[PDB]
């Protein structure tokens, strides 16, 4: 239905590898150095790189943007400068790969920028998109990782807790918060935190303060605050920019 941006980026990157590989006299950079033919190469070069390894790295999803890709490519050039010298014929050949890469990247600049933003929404110009992405990660990577948290991952099931919704008027759970995040309900940490805190408050109301349910929700809330603290600078900036628009 929708295009997969890493599937797309990787194809664009691999086709740039294909074009560099087709450039004249580039074969020494096609595969990793064989030390039996390139004397003491690995004693001299600490971080070897070559186009086959670069392609394998693309296929491992190692490059979410053009910059990490270009870094490794440029390392091919650096390594030739160190081993053979900056004006050696091989260094100019490697430089010719990097120059063709730079041309190809410039030609597709705009497409690459959309892909990189889709792959990493922190790069998105839309501040609400970035903010929501952060909140989503806090929920999936931190809150949902809390041990013993499974019953908080979905709404309480009245088949298993028949009384629950007779006591609790405003139920809340982590899946519902994620649905809220995906709809961009939250423009600031405060409205996000009102929903997260509601999870704990409901467990206090329904179970009491000494319940396991309450200790688990307390930990969920705690990692949520701990995590938002870690990201304070970026979230503050994003909050400020969402309020401007």
C-alpha 223/C-alpha 215 separation (Å) is: 13
Taken in order 121, 123, 124, 128, is the CA torsion positive or negative?
positive
Q: Taking the mean position of all CA atoms in its chain, how far away is CA 221?
A: 24
H-helix segments, 108-156:
109-119, 127-137
Query: Is residue 241 within 8 Å of 131, Cβ to Cβ?
Result: no
Among residues 125, 12, 107, 1, the alpha carbon closest in space to that of 65 is found at: 12
Tokens 């440029």 correspond to: 74
Question: Per-residue DSSP letters for 154-173?
Answer: SPPPTTTSTTHHHH-SS---
Of the candidates 158, 180, 177, the residue with the CA atom closest to the CA atom of residue 167: 158
Three-state secondary structure call for residue 97: helix
Q: How far is CA 45 from the centre of its chain?
A: 30
Specify the DSSP element, H or E, that contains 75.
helix 66-84
Cβ atoms of residues 132 and 221 within 8 Å: no
User: Distance between CA 137 and CA 131 in Å, rounded?
Assistant: 10
Resolution in Å, one decimal place: 2.2
CA–CA dist 40, 34 (Å, integer): 10
Q: Are 174 and 200 in contact (CB under 8 A)?
A: no
Residues 70 and 140: their CA atoms lie apart, in Å, by 31
Map tokens 């100019």 to a residue.
92
Measured in whole angstroms, the distance separating CA 220 from the mean position of its chain's CA atoms is 23
């Amino acid at each position: 239905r929708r295009t997969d941006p890493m599937v797309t980026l990787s194809s664009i990157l691999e086709s740039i590898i294909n074009d560099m590989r087709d450039l004249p006299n580039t074969y020494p950079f096609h595969t990793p150095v064989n030390a039996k033919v390139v004397k003491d190469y690995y004693k001299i070069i600490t971080r070897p790189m070559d186009l086959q390894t670069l392609r394998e790295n693309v296929r491992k999803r190692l490059y979410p943007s053009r910059e990490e890709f270009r870094e490794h490519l440029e390392l091919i050039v650096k390594n030739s400068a160190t081993y053979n010298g900056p004006k050696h014929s091989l260094t100019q050949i490697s430089q010719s790969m990097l120059d063709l890469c730079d041309e190809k990247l410039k030609e597709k600049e705009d497409k690459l920028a959309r892909l990189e933003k889709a792959i990493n929404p922190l790069l998105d110009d839309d501040d609400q998109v970035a903010f929501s992405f952060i909140l989503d990660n806090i929920v999936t990577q931190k809150m949902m990782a809390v041990p013993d948290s499974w019953p908080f991952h979905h709404p309480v099931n009245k088949k298993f807790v028949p009384d629950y919704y007779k006591v609790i008027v405003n139920p809340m759970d982590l899946e519902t918060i994620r649905k809220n995040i995906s709809k961009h309900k939250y423009q600031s940490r405060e409205s996000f935190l009102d929903d997260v805190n509601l999870i704990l408050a409901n467990s206090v109301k329904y179970n009491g303060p000494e319940s396991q349910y309450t200790k688990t929700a307390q930990e969920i809330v705690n990692v949520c605050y701990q995590t938002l603290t870690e990201y304070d600078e970026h979230l503050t900036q994003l909050e400020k920019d969402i309020c401007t628009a």
